[PDB]
Amino acid sequence: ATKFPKFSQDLAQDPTTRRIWYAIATAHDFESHDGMTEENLYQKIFASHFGHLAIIFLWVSGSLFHVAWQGNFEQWIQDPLNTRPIAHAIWDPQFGKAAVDAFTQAGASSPVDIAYSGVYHWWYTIGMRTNGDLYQGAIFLLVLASLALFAGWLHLQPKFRPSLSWFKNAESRLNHHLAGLFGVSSLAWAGHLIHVAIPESRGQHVGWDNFLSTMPHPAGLAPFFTGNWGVYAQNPDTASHVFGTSQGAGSAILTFLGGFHPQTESLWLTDMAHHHLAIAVLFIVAGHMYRTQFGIGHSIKEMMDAKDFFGTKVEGPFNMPHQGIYETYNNSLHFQLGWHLACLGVITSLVAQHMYSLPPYAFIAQDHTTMAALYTHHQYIAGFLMVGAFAHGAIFLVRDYDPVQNKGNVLDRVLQHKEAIISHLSWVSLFLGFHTLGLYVHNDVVVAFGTPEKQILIEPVFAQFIQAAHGKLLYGFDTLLSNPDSIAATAWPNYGNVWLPGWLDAINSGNNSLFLTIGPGDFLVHHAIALGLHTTTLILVKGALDARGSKLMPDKKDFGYAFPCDGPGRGGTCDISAWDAFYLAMFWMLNTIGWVTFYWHWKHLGVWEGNVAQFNENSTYLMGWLRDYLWLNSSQLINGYNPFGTNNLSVWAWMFLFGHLVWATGFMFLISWRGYWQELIETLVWAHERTPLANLVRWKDKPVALSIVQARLVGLAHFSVGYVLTYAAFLIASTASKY
């Protein structure tokens, strides 16, 4: 045997190379390790969380330090529309002189990378103005990572290891996260915005050296111990305000103007501080809800077990049986993980959908490439998180679901009618797919034969009506908030809209991306998204719900989450496992997010260049997507290096080709399967053992082919890496060669 892996003796007595590979893939599956108890399990979870927190802090520290050290932060401060932000310096000894000249950009003397995270805009919006502020933030995050590392180490010391009853205290955690994390952290951020970010927006330096001696409001802390709150909102920052300077500077610190700052092109900072105040107060109230140890409070378990509505029968909350769902939630870490990843994926996607249309940062809507990168990044993260949510739901259903403790409740009735669930998911998937592919191919065929008038073009009149209901008078609906006389517009009893002038100018001045104009191309694409979401959901739900057992395999719970198959018997059982359904749905999620990001990017290129007719006339067939979006915009990307020389796009051309290579390399692992490679490695073993001067050196682990699940994972990882790198290369180069 070998020492490695310590956590699994089954892999430790393995004499093959597989012992290494599986160990790397089972190092974080703590429950399946040898000698695992629930106590030590949960404590390891806690310390790994602290370690991850420290990694996050080190990462932000690195970004801040490289911008402060090798970036052009202050040069970008003085001219944020015409200066490229520098990520970090390049040190590649293999560069020729042409690549040194080509990467000497953004006012630098050396080769540098252009930052496309938008971190410059977010740091400029939050009051950071010199290199010293960023350097201080970098060292402070270096301190915070150290504190997180020490806390993770401490909570595994014998005296400081938290008890299992502490970990299972959902009431206390909910209260302290809603009011402490979610509430007090938002209160503190409103405090930062009011105390620092708004003064630096108005030209004033409120550093750590004078914040105790600088009042936020000219007669401040008097109006809000008296109910005179409106004094903090009397003179808002003027529409002639120049950001970072006192020219036209107002003095309000909490407004509800609505719409955008006109020069900075983002939302108002005072409006953000007021939002954060409202959110903090609401979240402290929400965290004042559950019964921890002071008698007052709610308890979730009693609500889940409640069957009494003031004398009525009620099966439970909403007359739906809910017994043991508290126990199911709190005892299964995989249920918790699946739920929390679903919530996280939803809000990450909401972040993506809200930042492009409500830009929150100074002049970030003018940095088109960073906006593209941020939308695409957060949508891909959201897709990955949703797939992980459903994967851990499946893992919970194979490893933690007790039908006895869930006998009767909502989860049991879902498991009752899982076939109707999966079948109607199949129906809506086929529905959407058949019709969207059909309308697209009809448009393609009639445009091909020189007849674009025969295109089935369907206006998104429901979403256009919603846009009108937000205030866009372009469509001519004359409905709520686009009629000045609707009771929604005037708010008849209180007359307290006040957001509405700013928002109405925002919605009815096309210079932004707030509720962009949509047409039949947008209809067809949104149905492609609907198809993609439904089919990825279908794969993941069929995997999770039919993971405990199938009609083909009615003992699938006993084989675990990941297993290759049940063999070629019973008709053939390739990819029967619940891991394999995750593996299938990852491709579908990648395709769906590629669709959403293609849509976003082509529409925004048409909007930024002003040629919106390009999208509104060519996105209805699918050669428009190939010619006017994929073939065209790659043109500068692919000339990143040519026989005539190297541009600064040589990185993105090289990474474009590299992503194509990784993506195609994955196809090898996904298409060719194991026994071929095992038979080939057998001949290689024979050749090595019968070669003179080579038989003197022998392997310590016997060479075997990759396992079935392993190479499924390897091909999926290669496919995903190639997918992501290829699209990131195309996005950055097609959006950075112009704007």
Binding site: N319, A469, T479, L480
Partner: peptide
Amino acid sequence: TYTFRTFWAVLLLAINFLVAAYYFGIL
């Protein structure tokens, strides 16, 4: 006898038809 579920579905249908009346200019 389907009373609870019918009430909730009828409520949701009523919200749908209220938005439809907004759409068609009746409201």
